[PDB]
Amino acid sequence: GAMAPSYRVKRMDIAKNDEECVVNAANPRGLPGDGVCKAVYKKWPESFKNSATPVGTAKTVMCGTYPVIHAVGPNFSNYTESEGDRELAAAYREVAKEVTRLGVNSVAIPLLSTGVYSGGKDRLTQSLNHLFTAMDSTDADVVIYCRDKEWEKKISEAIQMRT
C-alpha cells in the first residue's frame, strides 16, 4: 500500500487517471453504456470481455496489465430507497475487496449511482459515505473523479472535515 494512504478528488475524465487501476460505474450486462462507462469503454475496450456481473457486485478484467474493476451500483429508478442503499453499500465493499486482492497502491474511483442511476436525486453525500465506509480499511491512495465544479468543492470539504 501507499506510505501515507490518502483521499483526493479531481474534476476531469476518469479515463485520463494517474492511478494503478480504475473503477468503472458499470451496468450489469457489460454494455458500453454512457458517462463514466462510455469513457472506460473508449479507453479500455478489452476490459469488457465477460465484465457482466450483478447489481451490488464488482468484477475485475485486465486491459493488458491495467486492472478495470466493473462495479455495478443500483439504478434508484428500479430500486426502493431502502434496497437501493443496501446494494450501493455492497458495490463499494466489493470494490475494497478487489483493490486489496490486486495489491495496487492507488485507485481512481467515481461516485456510483449519482448520474443516470440516481433516479433524479442528489446522492453525493450518500454515495461518498458508502465509498468511505468500504475504503477506510484499505491502504491504497484513493482518487475520486467528478465533473461538476460544486460537487468537487463538496467532496473536497467532506475529505478535509475528517482530517
Ligand SMILES: Cc1nc(N)ccc1Br
Ligand atoms: C469522471 C467522469 N469521467 C467521464 N468521462 C464521465 C463522467 C465522469 Br463523472
Ligand SMILES: [Cl-]
Ligand atoms: Cl478532462
Ligand SMILES: [Cl-]
Ligand atoms: Cl450513475
Ligand SMILES: [Cl-]
Ligand atoms: Cl460530477
